[PDB]
Write a protein that binds this ligand. Sequence first.
Ligand code: HEM
Ligand code: HEM
Ligand code: HEM
Ligand code: HEM
Ligand SMILES: [Mg+2]
Ligand SMILES: [Mg+2]
Ligand SMILES: [O]
Ligand SMILES: [O]
Ligand SMILES: [O]
Ligand SMILES: [O]
Lengths: 305, 306, 306, 305, 306, 306
Amino acid sequence: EPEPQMVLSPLTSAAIFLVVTIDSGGEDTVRDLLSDVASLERAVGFRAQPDGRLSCVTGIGSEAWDRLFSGARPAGLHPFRELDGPVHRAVATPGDLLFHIRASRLDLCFALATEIMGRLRGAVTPQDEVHGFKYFDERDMLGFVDGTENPTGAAARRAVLVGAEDPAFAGGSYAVVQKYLHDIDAWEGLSVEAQERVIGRRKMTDVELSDDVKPADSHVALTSVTGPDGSDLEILRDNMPFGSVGREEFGTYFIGYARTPEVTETMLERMFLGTASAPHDRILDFSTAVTGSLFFTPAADFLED
Amino acid sequence: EPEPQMVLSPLTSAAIFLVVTIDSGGEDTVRDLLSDVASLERAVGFRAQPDGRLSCVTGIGSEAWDRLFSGARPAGLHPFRELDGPVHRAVATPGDLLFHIRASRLDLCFALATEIMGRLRGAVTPQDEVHGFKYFDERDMLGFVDGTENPTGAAARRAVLVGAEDPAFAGGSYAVVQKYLHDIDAWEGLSVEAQERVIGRRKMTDVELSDDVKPADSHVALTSVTGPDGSDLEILRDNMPFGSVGREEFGTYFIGYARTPEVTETMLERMFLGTASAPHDRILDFSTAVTGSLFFTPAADFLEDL
Amino acid sequence: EPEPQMVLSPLTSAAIFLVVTIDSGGEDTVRDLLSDVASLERAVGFRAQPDGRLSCVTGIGSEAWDRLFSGARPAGLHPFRELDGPVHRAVATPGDLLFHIRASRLDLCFALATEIMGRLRGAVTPQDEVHGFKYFDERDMLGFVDGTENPTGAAARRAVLVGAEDPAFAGGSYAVVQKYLHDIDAWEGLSVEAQERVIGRRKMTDVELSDDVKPADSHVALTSVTGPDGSDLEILRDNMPFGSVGREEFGTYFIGYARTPEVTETMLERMFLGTASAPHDRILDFSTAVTGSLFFTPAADFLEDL
Amino acid sequence: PEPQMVLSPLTSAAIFLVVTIDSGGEDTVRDLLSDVASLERAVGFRAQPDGRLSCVTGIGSEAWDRLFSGARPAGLHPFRELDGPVHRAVATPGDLLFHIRASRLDLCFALATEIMGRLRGAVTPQDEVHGFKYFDERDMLGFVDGTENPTGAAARRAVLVGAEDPAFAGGSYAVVQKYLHDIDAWEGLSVEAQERVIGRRKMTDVELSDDVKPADSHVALTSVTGPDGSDLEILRDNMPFGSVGREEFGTYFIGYARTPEVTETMLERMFLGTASAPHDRILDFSTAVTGSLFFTPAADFLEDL
Amino acid sequence: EPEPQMVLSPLTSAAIFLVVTIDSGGEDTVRDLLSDVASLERAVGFRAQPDGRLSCVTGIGSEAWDRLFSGARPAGLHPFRELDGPVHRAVATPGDLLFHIRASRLDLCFALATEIMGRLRGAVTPQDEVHGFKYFDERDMLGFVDGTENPTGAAARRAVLVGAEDPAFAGGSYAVVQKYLHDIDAWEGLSVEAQERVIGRRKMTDVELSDDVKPADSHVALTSVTGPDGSDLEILRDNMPFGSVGREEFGTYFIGYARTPEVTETMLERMFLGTASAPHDRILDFSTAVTGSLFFTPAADFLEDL
Amino acid sequence: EPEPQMVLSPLTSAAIFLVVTIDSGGEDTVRDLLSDVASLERAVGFRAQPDGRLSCVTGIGSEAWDRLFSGARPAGLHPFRELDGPVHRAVATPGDLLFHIRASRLDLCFALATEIMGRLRGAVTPQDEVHGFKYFDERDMLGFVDGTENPTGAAARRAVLVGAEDPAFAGGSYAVVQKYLHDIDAWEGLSVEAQERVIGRRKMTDVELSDDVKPADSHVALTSVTGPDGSDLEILRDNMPFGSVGREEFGTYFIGYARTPEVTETMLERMFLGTASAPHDRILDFSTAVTGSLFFTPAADFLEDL
Ligand code: HEM
Ligand code: HEM
Ligand code: HEM
Ligand code: HEM
Ligand SMILES: [Mg+2]
Ligand SMILES: [Mg+2]
Ligand SMILES: [O]
Ligand SMILES: [O]
Ligand SMILES: [O]
Ligand SMILES: [O]
């Protein structure tokens, strides 16, 4: 039965992330837009086929769900949980709707964003807008290849899409976003070897460091989680650089999709609160989260009504 | 011959415009950067050949010129002249240095901008930063094809590059920038036929309206100027959309290059002050200028040799 | 179990449509060719992989089916039904075989057509041959984007392929073709807003007109059908422009695939005969059908086993 | 003086349009000629840099005299019919030529539509061919077509009128012939026999060596040296065309040269033969059904009307 | 399914074939590498996505299987069988591990091969290393299109992947490799028509010769085998040219995958030993095999978990 | 101009370098081939236009020049001069003819090489054959971007092509080749920072190290040469990786073109013999030259008229 949104997108080099809150009285305007967003996606993107690769994934937060709909809630939907670690904090910030807009070119992203916000004028308040761009060798702002170990094909379907465990919402997914700002001057004072020790992979060749040399507090060490049976727990990420040279903002916009938020939240706890072997993820010594929100991205059929 | 900077670039779909002023004491840091900016362009761009098409054109304002260099000045170099029209105004805003960075993708522009501003930290103050993107059919924010009548090839070299009239600065050019914000709601209330009358060309097919029907106050009518020579006076433009949907900013970043500022300045007078037959350019009823600066972009050799 | 033909093709920018009748005595030659047409598609196409995207969909008409095969007929196969509306007429023209050839380039289409017709000469008579091309950004000759609301992925498979309702023929599809010629002079005398009222979508941006404003005799209004159960009835279309400038022929070659012809036929009745609120589809005031035929496109394994 | 785009990049699509000028049509035509470059930019600019749309406009001998007064190009005359013992090169009407080329047919067709829209009621179509590149620069006989064309400066020198006719410098002369091929007869030859007709190898496009290339091969007869020992060259941009239902398989020949004498010498050798060769063997499988000669002026000549 | 390795790869235009033997003591080094080969594939390939199309298929020979693993063997796994025909011989040459590395560019192949062999240094001995390149119309060194009749889609999965007949090893496949060197001077002395009679297809157009003219000793005739049920038995091939102009080596590296080696072995017997109708495959009069090995390529899960 | 060979090629991602010696008696065969090498470039290349970008540059050695040609010699032609440094040695190896073949794909290079060697069979002896491939981000085998500071456009024409200083040979160039093998084990034992000190540029970003930190014995410091005039002396390099993973050969094939050999030879003396402040180029601590030859690459017209 259920047609998912375009959560599993091809590689795209541009993105717009748009996070808004729904104002008092705005619920009907929002409901109308949600039922049309797929046809807007086609209107803007069809004529730019096949290279445009335009898609929009729409997500709805826990409090907004209760304002918009009655009846069943997705089983895993709750507000993003703040993490107050000994050193680093993951903040929770307001957000009722997410539009994750991706394409091969920024203009297509912007054209679709314009149409969406045009219909929502007067009903919502912008909280965050980020124009992301991938570097040409899939590198992020820290200079490392970003995306390598994402699951693909059936492994990805199994990791990201709600199934039989919550059958009313099958084909949906849960998205966590965080906007990170980096301290680039501190980062660039590390040697490459030191940087590799923070991430857990070689910088130029993107080969994973072996088990015997990878630090316990490296990013890859802490975000590798096995579940009860010893299989790996996976998420699908599509992190995007963004910034402004004039204001000295250099950032990574983190977005992670998973079939239940528990996987993403466990990775976050390991990063921010630590383990027995690690105080915290070393990447956080160069990266500060300034937003944090959780959304449910329903199956596309759910929005079509 | 001297080597010009990459004023005549291929079509590029992304740009960063950076305008800065030079702080007290900043001149030495700036001069060092100017002499390396071509090698930064190659360092960032060479590994992304041949698709990247990264280039950087560096321009220097009138006041800055005198702080940085002694000796001759380019003949046409002066501060941007405000035009206070009956209805519309072309404002002047501060700017000592211009970096016009272009490529096929934004990331390359950003990488080069990062390196340039890294070398200038503590010597300059940012005045403007715009990340521009072209729409997929060469359209601008108003929905019209933008660039069609630009000169190409030898006609472009002749229109844009200083020559024997100022031989110490041959291979340079003059750049005018203005950031425009549009009233999209007003524009979208016009019919297509009305919009065509404001521009002077057909929207869908980009065919110029004939002389017998194009209004005197259309954009194309007012920006067509013939010189005393009988010849058309031409500039080279590379206008770029930009914006922010959350702030409702929809804009066109205008940049026009010419061998002398007099050509560009004449067009601006016609648009803002009008003619015998036209109050002002109708495009300005949907577009407000919020910056305005003039720069000289020297030949590449001039910068290398510092 | 069954392998369909390439009804669900990627976007392709060239097509040849070939419609022939089977002469008396030609049946054996045709049956031989049918069993080899997949081989020929590989012979011509393989060397241009992966970019060529060459495919041939072969369709058989109602009367030809009875000449070629005995045993079961697909449940929905009949001759195209002529529609005699008060103003506009959908003609039925002869056609026994359809070859719908698509690729990313016309040379591949032509090469495969040449091989097919080479085997069939002496057994068939050509009735229609159209060379189609993609026009800009998926536009048709009326200047509108064409294909936007086609179904994709799973919804496409369900709308187009025969399943358990006719299990001997599962994996087949029904194709309806009509060649349309446009009155471009009349069309271009409309304003863009009036054209948008004929189609039901915005011209430049391809955004559907809202329920508030979309006329009931617009093309989009009349070709939207909900079935008894409230769900939409969808077809898959791959309309191609064609023309000749010196003859003033500007055309749309319509082809629509569906799992039963009744969906397509309902859409046709609405367009030509009208509804309570709409006399006929306004697009027909600028479009004349000069061919009309219906074919069954069997699963690929049906053709291989002859 | 700026030439028209006679020297085009390689393009995979073309439209050739040949028309006659009706009585009274001269003024409409002159107005169009002064706008044709503008139309080329309007249709082509939005598809840059890939589109490579160009239009070369040519004027026949009788038409020149109806449109213009004063001095005429030195070599401009009606195509000369050649009545050989076996094969004939016919002359057919044509006052104006539009040779429209691009990387896609749609651009060609859009420009042709605009041109003919302006000429409606002043001209009568004589010939319209939509050409396509066939595979790896092959023609309808299955041989690579284009290999020995001149390039760069050698091409400029072979095709552009210069100091020998200074009032018309930057112009060129175009000869067109539409050929139909008897493919059934051609395909009855072995590959080795076909190679003997053309003078090059079929699969590899290597020229046959001088000791085995026949005197009546196409390459032998179209190789001409001038009195000073240099090669006389033309620039060709032959295009396949056809209709499978009518069994029409064709080559649209177009040859540009700085004087029609070069092209005409080649044609005489092909149709009328030499001491050692009755005629070009390619003509035993190829019938000319059109023949016209045009002068393609410098671009400034057309702008200034 | 279990997840197979990338046996069914898109068309790729470069390859490296690496065949090694495992030295005494090398077993544990090899086992460690096998369990990381998929992650090396992603490390080298990810940053060149989506155009890179880098994949590595790893296979294990019969004798090596017994050294490396205890427990079940794949049912079809045995050493390549030498064929000593009346005229032509298929030699068997040593090989424990196969790395079949494919991409759209040689450098990706080479980078992955470097990482693999860097981990194996001192545990293995290289027996064969071939750098292959496709000619631009999918042609091989004899000038014929190579790969036309390969199965695709479901037919390919059914032909190449082990299923319920050996359920512990489902998702695996069997690969046979042979390096062939060609006598190009002799081949070029045949007419095209004679060459077509050797292969069984037309050279220029790649159309199969009809049954009435195709010789019984042509390559296509002898490699067509039907199974008990009258269905064709198919393999998947990805033959690659290679060579050295200075040494006058012009070669075809044959690799054929099948769900059981019996299919491939039948074809080889027909080619080298002949049949009642055919002395041997005429292609062997212009081609000499200088290597021959058989490998099992396990499902990707099998490699991960050990 | 006279017409030069394609010394200034676009970026190409494949190359074959072929060096041969002329056997005695072979001179007539070679002169015949030289006069046809341009037509063979077109025969192989034209059908792959415009993407193939196949070119062949043909170079002749000092001693071969004397055997092949009647009259005057290019002024700078002599045998490669061996350099016997205190630690490292640049060897001179035999080479009469160089074919420097480049394209976007290796098959086109191989096809042209095959045709050339076909005509030379029996008259020449191969000395070296290298199949080169570029890494995906213009990197060399040491992991550094390679080519960044090459001259471009007019500056390239002036650095590379013989002009009025030797007017009978205007439009020619001089090529130096050296095949280098690297000690990758040693190199990979250095930290990135230490590697950056050997080369003189940053590894990841390719930014040149600043003057106050760049070592005197870095590659970039030693290969930067100013002439008498204050101006920089430039060469045009097209270095290609090559190798074989089984034999542990990881190589850079150096080729440098210049309008006089003096530029290239100065750079070589600085690398191998050192300066006041540098013993030798640190890159040579990880790179061994195993060939070395010098050739004159005539204008295209010179070769055509033989
Ligand atoms: C306000 C934002 C601006 C927009 C959106 C805009 C847009 C356009 C458009 C759509 C065209 C027609 C197609 C073309 O040839 O590019 C055009 C032409 C032109 N514009 Fe603008 N323009 C702007 C500002 C300016 C300014 C400030 C100047 C001069 C100072 C200028 C000078 C020209 C010129 C010279 C032409 C070509 C006229 C000719 O046809 O010969 N534009 N512009
Ligand atoms: C009948 C249709 C024609 C066909 C199919 C055709 C085809 C070919 C082919 C395959 C070649 C060899 C490859 C190449 O260099 O382009 C060639 C060469 C040539 N053709 Fe034609 N051709 C035709 C008519 C003509 C005509 C009418 C002329 C001259 C009036 C002509 C002049 C040439 C010239 C000059 C060459 C190059 C000869 C050289 O190597 O120097 N062709 N043609
Ligand atoms: C010198 C080695 C070889 C060359 C150059 C070669 C070349 C070709 C060519 C040109 C074709 C026809 C087009 C196609 O369908 O790919 C073909 C088909 C085929 N080859 Fe080979 N081949 C070689 C060795 C082998 C070997 C050793 C086998 C089997 C063990 C084999 C099995 C096949 C099969 C199964 C076909 C398809 C037959 C069909 O039409 O059903 N090939 N080969
Ligand atoms: C092992 C052999 C070689 C390797 C791996 C190598 C590598 C490099 C690298 C990585 C660069 C910096 C990037 C660039 O501008 O291209 C470079 C620059 C350069 N190399 Fe080499 N190179 C080699 C041999 C040579 C030789 C033998 C010469 C001269 C005869 C040479 C001359 C140069 C020059 C002139 C530059 C540019 C310096 C400048 O003006 O910045 N190289 N080389
Ligand atoms: Mg016939
Ligand atoms: Mg024998
Ligand atoms: O991540
Ligand atoms: O503009
Ligand atoms: O030709
Ligand atoms: O094969």
